[PDB]
Tab-separated table of C-alpha atoms in Angstrom:
chain	number	residue	atom	x	y	z
Y	115	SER	CA	-58.550	-44.959	-59.308
Y	116	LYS	CA	-58.969	-46.273	-55.766
Y	117	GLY	CA	-56.054	-43.891	-55.049
Y	118	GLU	CA	-58.185	-40.728	-55.202
Y	119	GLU	CA	-60.633	-42.298	-52.746
Y	120	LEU	CA	-57.906	-42.131	-50.066
Y	121	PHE	CA	-57.755	-38.326	-49.806
Y	122	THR	CA	-61.461	-37.586	-49.318
Y	123	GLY	CA	-60.665	-37.524	-45.593
Y	124	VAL	CA	-58.255	-35.603	-43.433
Y	125	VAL	CA	-55.141	-37.789	-43.708
Y	126	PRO	CA	-52.277	-37.662	-41.147
Y	127	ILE	CA	-48.797	-36.818	-42.453
Y	128	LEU	CA	-45.282	-37.807	-41.442
Y	129	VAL	CA	-42.166	-36.212	-42.934
Y	130	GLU	CA	-38.570	-37.309	-42.344
Y	131	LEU	CA	-35.574	-35.536	-43.887
Y	132	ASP	CA	-31.916	-36.479	-43.474
Y	133	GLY	CA	-29.715	-33.785	-44.988
Y	134	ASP	CA	-26.053	-32.864	-45.593
Y	135	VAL	CA	-25.352	-29.299	-46.788
Y	136	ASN	CA	-21.659	-28.485	-47.246
Y	137	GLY	CA	-20.873	-31.146	-44.657
Y	138	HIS	CA	-23.425	-29.843	-42.141
Y	139	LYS	CA	-25.570	-32.868	-41.279
Y	140	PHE	CA	-29.105	-32.408	-39.955
Y	141	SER	CA	-32.451	-34.138	-39.538
Y	142	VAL	CA	-35.997	-32.832	-39.628
Y	143	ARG	CA	-39.226	-34.547	-38.594
Y	144	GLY	CA	-42.658	-33.132	-39.406
Y	145	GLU	CA	-46.114	-34.240	-38.284
Y	146	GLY	CA	-49.465	-32.886	-39.440
Y	147	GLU	CA	-52.657	-33.414	-41.422
Y	148	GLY	CA	-53.784	-33.036	-45.020
Y	149	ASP	CA	-57.294	-32.183	-46.182
Y	150	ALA	CA	-56.826	-32.848	-49.895
Y	151	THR	CA	-60.305	-31.831	-51.007
Y	152	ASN	CA	-59.431	-28.252	-49.949
Y	153	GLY	CA	-55.720	-28.562	-50.775
Y	154	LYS	CA	-54.793	-27.627	-47.190
Y	155	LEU	CA	-51.809	-28.817	-45.135
Y	156	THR	CA	-51.021	-28.000	-41.477
Y	157	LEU	CA	-47.670	-29.424	-40.346
Y	158	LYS	CA	-45.018	-28.744	-37.708
Y	159	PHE	CA	-41.362	-29.530	-38.387
Y	160	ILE	CA	-38.491	-29.927	-35.943
Y	161	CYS	CA	-34.743	-30.060	-36.407
Y	162	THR	CA	-33.989	-33.075	-34.266
Y	163	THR	CA	-30.210	-32.676	-34.697
Y	164	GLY	CA	-30.166	-29.173	-33.145
Y	165	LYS	CA	-30.043	-25.770	-34.880
Y	166	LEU	CA	-30.905	-26.180	-38.560
Y	167	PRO	CA	-27.898	-25.002	-40.668
Y	168	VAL	CA	-29.861	-23.631	-43.630
Y	169	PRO	CA	-32.926	-21.298	-43.377
Y	170	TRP	CA	-36.249	-23.149	-43.057
Y	171	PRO	CA	-37.747	-21.707	-46.311
Y	172	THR	CA	-35.195	-23.598	-48.423
Y	173	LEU	CA	-36.674	-26.890	-47.200
Y	174	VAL	CA	-40.371	-26.011	-47.649
Y	175	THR	CA	-40.536	-27.330	-51.230
Y	176	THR	CA	-38.619	-30.470	-50.250
Y	177	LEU	CA	-40.858	-30.831	-47.146
Y	179	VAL	CA	-46.434	-33.988	-50.622
Y	180	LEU	CA	-48.467	-32.851	-53.633
Y	181	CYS	CA	-50.980	-35.680	-53.412
Y	182	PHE	CA	-52.733	-33.218	-51.070
Y	183	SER	CA	-53.336	-30.748	-53.917
Y	184	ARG	CA	-56.968	-29.770	-54.553
Y	185	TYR	CA	-57.618	-31.007	-58.101
Y	186	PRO	CA	-60.934	-29.478	-59.330
Y	187	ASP	CA	-63.492	-32.008	-60.591
Y	188	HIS	CA	-62.908	-30.977	-64.209
Y	189	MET	CA	-59.224	-31.899	-63.690
Y	190	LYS	CA	-59.423	-35.056	-61.536
Y	191	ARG	CA	-58.209	-37.003	-64.583
Y	192	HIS	CA	-54.787	-35.336	-64.157
Y	193	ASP	CA	-53.976	-36.050	-60.456
Y	194	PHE	CA	-51.019	-38.394	-61.050
Y	195	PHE	CA	-50.042	-37.997	-57.418
Y	196	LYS	CA	-53.149	-39.544	-55.891
Y	197	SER	CA	-53.400	-42.082	-58.708
Y	198	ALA	CA	-50.044	-43.588	-57.682
Y	199	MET	CA	-51.343	-44.207	-54.138
Y	200	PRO	CA	-51.171	-46.175	-52.007
Y	201	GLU	CA	-48.317	-47.856	-53.877
Y	202	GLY	CA	-46.592	-44.453	-53.630
Y	203	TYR	CA	-44.262	-42.411	-55.860
Y	204	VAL	CA	-40.665	-41.157	-55.896
Y	205	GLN	CA	-39.938	-37.429	-56.034
Y	206	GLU	CA	-36.448	-36.470	-57.182
Y	207	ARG	CA	-35.599	-32.785	-57.524
Y	208	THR	CA	-32.600	-30.609	-58.387
Y	209	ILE	CA	-32.758	-27.177	-56.798
Y	210	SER	CA	-30.296	-24.630	-58.127
Y	211	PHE	CA	-30.011	-21.421	-56.112
Y	212	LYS	CA	-29.065	-18.588	-58.478
Y	213	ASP	CA	-25.486	-17.482	-57.682
Y	214	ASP	CA	-25.229	-20.082	-54.871
Y	215	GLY	CA	-25.165	-23.862	-54.305
Y	216	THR	CA	-27.539	-26.618	-55.463
Y	217	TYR	CA	-29.786	-29.106	-53.626
Y	218	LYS	CA	-30.308	-32.689	-54.775
Y	219	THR	CA	-33.321	-34.406	-53.121
Y	220	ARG	CA	-34.732	-37.924	-53.492
Y	221	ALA	CA	-37.961	-38.774	-51.647
Y	222	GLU	CA	-40.434	-41.628	-51.232
Y	223	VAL	CA	-44.075	-40.622	-50.774
Y	224	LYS	CA	-46.186	-43.635	-49.792
Y	225	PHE	CA	-48.869	-44.653	-47.330
Y	226	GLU	CA	-47.506	-46.463	-44.293
Y	227	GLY	CA	-50.648	-47.642	-42.521
Y	228	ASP	CA	-53.203	-44.838	-42.227
Y	229	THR	CA	-50.473	-42.195	-42.499
Y	230	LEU	CA	-48.893	-40.643	-45.602
Y	231	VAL	CA	-45.104	-40.466	-45.242
Y	232	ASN	CA	-42.594	-38.279	-47.094
Y	233	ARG	CA	-39.131	-39.752	-46.476
Y	234	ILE	CA	-36.312	-37.657	-47.977
Y	235	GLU	CA	-32.538	-37.589	-48.415
Y	236	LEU	CA	-31.031	-34.187	-49.304
Y	237	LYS	CA	-27.454	-33.339	-50.299
Y	238	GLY	CA	-26.357	-29.741	-50.856
Y	239	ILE	CA	-23.110	-28.751	-52.595
Y	240	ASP	CA	-21.221	-25.532	-53.366
Y	241	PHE	CA	-23.186	-23.239	-51.048
Y	242	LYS	CA	-21.400	-19.939	-50.357
Y	243	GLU	CA	-20.368	-19.605	-46.709
Y	244	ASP	CA	-21.559	-15.987	-46.526
Y	245	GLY	CA	-24.193	-16.674	-49.211
Y	246	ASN	CA	-27.894	-16.045	-48.616
Y	247	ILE	CA	-28.472	-19.679	-47.628
Y	248	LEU	CA	-25.502	-20.497	-45.391
Y	249	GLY	CA	-25.430	-16.917	-44.057
Y	250	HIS	CA	-29.084	-17.110	-42.923
Y	251	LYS	CA	-30.054	-14.008	-44.918
Y	252	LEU	CA	-33.499	-15.261	-46.000
Y	253	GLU	CA	-36.742	-13.839	-44.588
Y	254	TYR	CA	-38.931	-16.292	-42.637
Y	255	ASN	CA	-41.778	-16.312	-45.150
Y	256	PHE	CA	-42.821	-17.979	-48.416
Y	257	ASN	CA	-44.351	-16.600	-51.623
Y	258	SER	CA	-46.934	-17.920	-54.081
Y	259	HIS	CA	-45.767	-20.024	-57.018
Y	260	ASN	CA	-46.992	-22.032	-59.981
Y	261	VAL	CA	-45.673	-25.583	-60.255
Y	262	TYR	CA	-45.727	-26.402	-63.965
Y	263	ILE	CA	-46.416	-30.114	-64.487
Y	264	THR	CA	-46.017	-32.159	-67.667
Y	265	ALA	CA	-46.362	-35.900	-68.332
Y	266	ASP	CA	-43.365	-38.143	-68.963
Y	267	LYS	CA	-44.568	-41.043	-71.103
Y	268	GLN	CA	-40.964	-42.340	-71.261
Y	269	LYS	CA	-40.671	-42.948	-67.489
Y	270	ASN	CA	-44.413	-43.446	-66.830
Y	271	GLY	CA	-44.482	-40.408	-64.540
Y	272	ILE	CA	-44.325	-36.610	-64.638
Y	273	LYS	CA	-41.762	-33.834	-64.701
Y	274	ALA	CA	-42.193	-30.339	-63.293
Y	275	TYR	CA	-40.334	-27.034	-63.247
Y	276	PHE	CA	-40.891	-23.905	-61.179
Y	277	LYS	CA	-38.869	-20.982	-59.811
Y	278	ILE	CA	-39.140	-20.232	-56.092
Y	279	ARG	CA	-38.705	-16.598	-55.075
Y	280	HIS	CA	-37.115	-16.470	-51.607
Y	281	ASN	CA	-37.310	-12.981	-50.094
Y	282	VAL	CA	-33.949	-11.793	-48.735
Y	283	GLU	CA	-33.444	-9.550	-45.682
Y	284	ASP	CA	-31.774	-6.844	-47.780
Y	285	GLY	CA	-34.812	-6.528	-50.071
Y	286	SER	CA	-33.291	-8.664	-52.836
Y	287	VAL	CA	-34.648	-12.010	-54.002
Y	288	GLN	CA	-32.935	-15.382	-53.896
Y	289	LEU	CA	-34.060	-17.478	-56.856
Y	290	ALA	CA	-34.187	-21.264	-56.898
Y	291	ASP	CA	-34.946	-23.171	-60.101
Y	292	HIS	CA	-36.649	-26.452	-59.225
Y	293	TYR	CA	-36.292	-29.381	-61.626
Y	294	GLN	CA	-38.593	-32.216	-60.549
Y	295	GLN	CA	-39.263	-35.819	-61.623
Y	296	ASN	CA	-41.929	-38.122	-60.175
Y	297	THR	CA	-42.039	-41.842	-60.958
Y	298	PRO	CA	-44.491	-44.409	-59.456
Y	299	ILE	CA	-43.293	-46.974	-56.923
Y	300	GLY	CA	-46.212	-49.214	-57.906
Y	301	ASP	CA	-46.679	-50.941	-61.262
Y	302	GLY	CA	-50.398	-50.138	-60.882
Y	303	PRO	CA	-52.053	-47.919	-63.564
Y	304	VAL	CA	-51.302	-44.207	-63.179
Y	305	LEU	CA	-52.998	-41.113	-64.622
Y	306	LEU	CA	-50.300	-39.558	-66.830
Y	307	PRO	CA	-51.800	-36.011	-66.966
Y	308	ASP	CA	-51.987	-33.226	-69.553
Y	309	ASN	CA	-50.036	-30.005	-69.004
Y	310	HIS	CA	-51.311	-27.937	-66.092
Y	311	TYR	CA	-49.992	-26.173	-63.006
Y	312	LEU	CA	-50.438	-25.961	-59.248
Y	313	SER	CA	-51.061	-22.576	-57.640
Y	314	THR	CA	-49.250	-22.897	-54.302
Y	315	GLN	CA	-49.478	-20.649	-51.257
Y	316	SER	CA	-47.817	-21.135	-47.876
Y	317	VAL	CA	-47.462	-19.440	-44.484
Y	318	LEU	CA	-44.541	-19.925	-42.103
Y	319	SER	CA	-45.016	-19.514	-38.361
Y	320	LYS	CA	-43.601	-20.461	-34.971
Y	321	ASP	CA	-45.088	-22.367	-32.068
Y	322	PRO	CA	-44.464	-19.868	-29.219
Y	323	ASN	CA	-43.957	-22.649	-26.661
Y	324	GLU	CA	-41.508	-24.639	-28.796
Y	325	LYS	CA	-37.864	-24.453	-27.703
Y	326	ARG	CA	-36.525	-26.659	-30.525
Y	327	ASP	CA	-35.609	-25.144	-33.896
Y	328	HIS	CA	-38.841	-25.668	-35.771
Y	329	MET	CA	-41.174	-24.407	-38.473
Y	330	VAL	CA	-44.970	-24.430	-38.548
Y	331	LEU	CA	-46.397	-24.589	-42.048
Y	332	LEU	CA	-49.783	-23.979	-43.608
Y	333	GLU	CA	-49.901	-24.680	-47.375
Y	334	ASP	CA	-52.870	-24.310	-49.796
Y	335	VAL	CA	-52.289	-25.956	-53.210
Y	336	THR	CA	-54.898	-25.949	-56.008
Y	337	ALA	CA	-54.674	-27.196	-59.604
Y	338	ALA	CA	-55.465	-25.081	-62.668
Y	339	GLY	CA	-54.565	-24.625	-66.347
Y	340	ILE	CA	-57.289	-26.790	-67.953
């Protein structure tokens, strides 16, 4: 589709998240760029509302898969790009083993030259001294496979994966991610065959930044076919 043609460049990225976790309200803005042919993202996020009440890693997944590097032999399966520039909706339930659950709804569309991920997030039943609300998570991310399958019934895709969040005490916080993507546009969309995305990410700080923030470098590539 004409959609894929849009990511052959470095595209600029905007991310806006409004969030309420156990009554704690917060907002996050991120700006950066996405070189989709290499699957690379370089973004900086800020908590505009003050100190972010959950640890930054929990938001990484919620904080644009269109920028995944889909090998040539798999380009027929890049639903994400194919739904552009019309855009797509990304709902996700995130259950943290032995802790609360996140419900996210997001719109991922081009606005002008920029790709924008706008997100609402509610979080319920998080333990006050739990790994999340007790800021017990290490400031790092692991490597994951995002398992994608087509959803003929809703003309989109579903996806499941399990994030491993390292914990300060040497344990692991698990988070089962249940994900649904449906196109905003009525335009034709490449419902893909089963495959997965090998994700990798690095979390860092801008040493001059005084605001609560997170610098992110992700590298997402498709495989499985």
